Amino acid sequence: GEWLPGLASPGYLTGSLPGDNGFDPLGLAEDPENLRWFVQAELVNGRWAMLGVAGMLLPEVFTSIGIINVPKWYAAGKEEYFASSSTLFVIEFILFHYVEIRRWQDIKNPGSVNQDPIFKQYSLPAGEVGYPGGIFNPLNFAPTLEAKEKEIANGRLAMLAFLGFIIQHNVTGKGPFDNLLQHISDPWHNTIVQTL
Amino acid sequence: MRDLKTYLSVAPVVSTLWFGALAGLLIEINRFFPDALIF
Amino acid sequence: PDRPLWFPGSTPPPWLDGSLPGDFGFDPLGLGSDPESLRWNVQAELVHSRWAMLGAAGIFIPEFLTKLGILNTPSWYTAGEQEYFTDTTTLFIVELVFIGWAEGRRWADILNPGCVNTDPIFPNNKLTGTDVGYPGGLWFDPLGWGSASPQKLKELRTKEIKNGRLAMLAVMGAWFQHIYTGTGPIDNLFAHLADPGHATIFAAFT
Amino acid sequence: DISGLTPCKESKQFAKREKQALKKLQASLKLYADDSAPALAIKATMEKTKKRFDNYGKYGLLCGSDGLPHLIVSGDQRHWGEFITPGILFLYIAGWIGWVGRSYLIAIRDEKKPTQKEIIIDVPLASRLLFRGFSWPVAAYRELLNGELVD
Numbered sequence: 233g234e235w236l237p238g239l240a241s242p243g244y245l246t247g248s249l250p251g252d253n254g255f256d257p258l259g260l261a262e263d264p265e266n267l268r269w270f271v272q273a274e275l276v277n278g279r280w281a282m283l284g285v286a287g288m289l290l291p292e293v294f295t296s297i298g299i300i301n302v303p304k305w306y307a308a309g310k311e312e313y314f315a316s317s318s319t320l321f322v323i324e325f326i327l328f329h330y331v332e333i334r335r336w337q338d339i340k341n342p343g344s345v346n347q348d349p350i351f352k353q354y355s356l357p358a359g360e361v362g363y364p365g366g367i368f369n370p371l372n373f374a375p376t377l378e379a380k381e382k383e384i385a386n387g388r389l390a391m392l393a394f395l396g397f398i399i400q401h402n403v404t405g406k407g408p409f410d411n412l413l414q415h416i417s418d419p420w421h422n423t424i425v426q427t428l
Numbered sequence: 429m430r431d432l433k434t435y436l437s438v439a440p441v442v443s444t445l446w447f448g449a450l451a452g453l454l455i456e457i458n459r460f461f462p463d464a465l466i467f
Numbered sequence: 468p469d470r471p472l473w474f475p476g477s478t479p480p481p482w483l484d485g486s487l488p489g490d491f492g493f494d495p496l497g498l499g500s501d502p503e504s505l506r507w508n509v510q511a512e513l514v515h516s517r518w519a520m521l522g523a524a525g526i527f528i529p530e531f532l533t534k535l536g537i538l539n540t541p542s543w544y545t546a547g548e549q550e551y552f553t554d555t556t557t558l559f560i561v562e563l564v565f566i567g568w569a570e571g572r573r574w575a576d577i578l579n580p581g582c583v584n585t586d587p588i589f590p591n592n593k594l595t596g597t598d599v600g601y602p603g604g605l606w607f608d609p610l611g612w613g614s615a616s617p618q619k620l621k622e623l624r625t626k627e628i629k630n631g632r633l634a635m636l637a638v639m640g641a642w643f644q645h646i647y648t649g650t651g652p653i654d655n656l657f658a659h660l661a662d663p664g665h666a667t668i669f670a671a672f673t
Numbered sequence: 674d675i676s677g678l679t680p681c682k683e684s685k686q687f688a689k690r691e692k693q694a695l696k697k698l699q700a701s702l703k704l705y706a707d708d709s710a711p712a713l714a715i716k717a718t719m720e721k722t723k724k725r726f727d728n729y730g731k732y733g734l735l736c737g738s739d740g741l742p743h744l745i746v747s748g749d750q751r752h753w754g755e756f757i758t759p760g761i762l763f764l765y766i767a768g769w770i771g772w773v774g775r776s777y778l779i780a781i782r783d784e785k786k787p788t789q790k791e792i793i794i795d796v797p798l799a800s801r802l803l804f805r806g807f808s809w810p811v812a813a814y815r816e817l818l819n820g821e822l823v824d
């Protein structure tokens with residue numbers, strides 16, 4: 233992979249990683265452990281970005297075609313729920329504390345965390361760090377290199393898409409799909425140029 | 429020519445150009461966003 | 468080694484052999500004394516030449532037809548300050564991304580001769596240019612005139628570079644003239660043809 | 674309000690200062706032809722002035738009994754722009770500079786004559802290390818945890 237043909241890929245990016253297109257011009261992953269931590273971080277930020285972006289765009293599209301009246305993502309938190317946002321935050325914080333500390337221990341030591349602390353009978357098969365599998369993969373799909381680099385690709389696209397959503401909402405004041413529609417309406421008179 | 433470039437890379441010349449560029453930048457910024465006391 | 472010079476009776480600089488198209492031993496400031504600098508300056512002179520030829524044609528051909536009943540296009544000097552179907556800034560952004568792509572691949576070519584000869588989408592199509600500054604291929608040389616004997620290449624590239632110099636000087640001339648006189652270049656040409664004795668640059672400065 | 678101060682948009686002395694300033698400018702403006710350059714200059718000063726006062730009022734600044742903006746740096750969330758934010762920006766830029774300089778000094782430390790590249794700057798090297806500063810918190814944070822920051 234060549235992100236900039238033909239710029240020589242850094243020595244520490246030997247293509248032994250999925251998504252290796254030789255893109256690290258600032259040399260952040262010059263250190264091996266740094267490269268590991270950043271691989272994990274790219275996977276995580278990427279997956280959460282995919283989920284988040286999906287949850288931002290998809291409900292709005294279905295609202296446009298009148299399937300279900302769903303409030304936009306930036307106006308969804310405002311006082312509509314049963315348990316209130318504070319309680320929700322405490323719950324979230326607790327469960328995420330447990331889960332993320334767990335995964336963290338997996339990153340610090342791969343084989344250290346794999347079995348259920350309560351029901352020690354059940355366990356997760358020794359796999360790759362960042363790719364747990366086992367119960368996390370009930371449909372038993374093969375973790376091929378292609379599938380991994382596809383995951384990372386859609387992840388990067390979704391991250392950029394999230395930045396796009398944030399900035400676009402910050403400027404226009406409408407939803408991303410709304411902006412897309414207005415762009416379809418008159419492309420040469422509805423861009424970042426006119427909105428600013 | 430290489431010697432001239434080397435001279436242009438000497439400390440005082442580099443400093444004049446660098447601080448000249450900075451002065452220009454800060455000036456233009458303070459012309460477009462003047463009287464800034466916040467941010 | 469044996470060639471006509473810009474300054475008869477002078478010795479050409481060591482770095483100017485004469486193996487380069489347009490070599491007349493002119494570099495009195497030694498701005499091309501270093502090989503890499505000379506090479507980069509060659510590419511820069513190429514793109515300058517071609518852009519200035521396109522430009523010179525672009526201001527002199529329409530202005531000459533505008534003076535006749537053929538066209539009615541406005542002055543080249545004020546063709547930018549007008550409005551179009553979209554704002555000029557949008558056009559400028561599209562220009563920046565497109566020309567940015569082209570100049571990007573060309574830059575990669577200058578810094579690494581081979582790396583940008585193949586089409587990233589369809590690996591079937593390639594460029595047949597041997598030396599940089601001359602891409603060739605089907606897109607940039609459909610008539611195949613780009614590949615020939617070193618003599619013909621020398622001649623053609625010399626013609627290219629010379630018409631380029633003349634064009635650069637011509638565009639600069641157009642700019643300065645429209646600044647001074649305040650009318651089109653054709654108007655100036657006809658005024659000078661009408662009275663070369665007085666209707667010159669001193670017809671306004673003195 | 675905070676510290677017994679009064680908001681600039683509600684401060685009388687703030688407004689009186691704007692008044693006296695504009696009136697001084699106009700009192701100077703009376704002597705020049707309206708189309709002349711001095712007139713346009715003084716008028717530019719007037720517009721800039723009132724725009725300044727209006728902007729300060731809009732920014733939510735608190736004024737003292739003097740009629741001047743006083744700053745709140747306690748960490749108060751209604752005034753993060755009065756120290757916290759520009760502080761963060763500063764720290765970012767300063768860290769950038771220092772980290773880049775550090776990179777440059779380390780890069781030439783292992784050479785025949787290091788002092789040379791300290792009196793005659795290696796501009797290609799400097800340009801290569803220039804943008805590395807953009808990610809200085811990330812780069813330094815990792816070097817901190819790694820043990821490549823100190824000896």
Ligand SMILES: CC(/C=C/C=C(C)/C=C/[C@@]12O[C@]1(C)C[C@@H](O)CC2(C)C)=C\C=C\C=C(C)\C=C\C=C(C)\C=C\[C@@]12O[C@]1(C)C[C@@H](O)CC2(C)C
Pocket residue numbers: 255256257258259260276277278280281282283284285287288304305306308309391392394395808
């Ligand atoms: C995780 C993420 C977003 C997650 C979003 C979520 C959970 C959204 C949740 C919600 O919407 C829903 C679901 C429903 C709403 O009701 C509620 C909210 C809460 C609003 C984005 C990451 C976003 C992350 C991004 C954009 C990262 C970009 C980084 C880049 C481009 C760095 C590039 C480089 O570092 C390299 C690669 C190499 C170096 O050498 C060179 C440089 C250039 C420095």
Ligand SMILES: CC(/C=C/C=C(C)/C=C/[C@@]12O[C@]1(C)C[C@@H](O)CC2(C)C)=C\C=C\C=C(C)\C=C\C=C(C)\C=C\[C@@]12O[C@]1(C)C[C@@H](O)CC2(C)C
Pocket residue numbers: 493494495496497498514515516518519520521522523524525526542543544546547635636638639
């Ligand atoms: C003059 C010029 C350069 C002159 C440089 C010279 C003599 C340097 C000479 C030396 O260095 C050497 C050789 C060797 C050294 O030892 C000695 C010196 C002496 C130091 C370049 C002009 C170069 C000029 C160029 C490239 C101009 C291109 C113009 C274009 C594209 C115009 C487009 C338009 O006009 C149209 C087409 C239609 C309009 O409506 C719209 C617009 C857009 C305005």
Ligand SMILES: CCCCCCCS[C@@H]1O[C@H](CO)[C@@H](O)[C@H](O)[C@H]1O
Pocket residue numbers: 429430431433434437793794795796797800
């Ligand atoms: C934006 C960077 C442009 C390239 C910098 C041009 C001068 S590069 C210059 O070259 C000299 C040798 O000739 C060296 O002695 C000197 O250290 C070096 O900085």
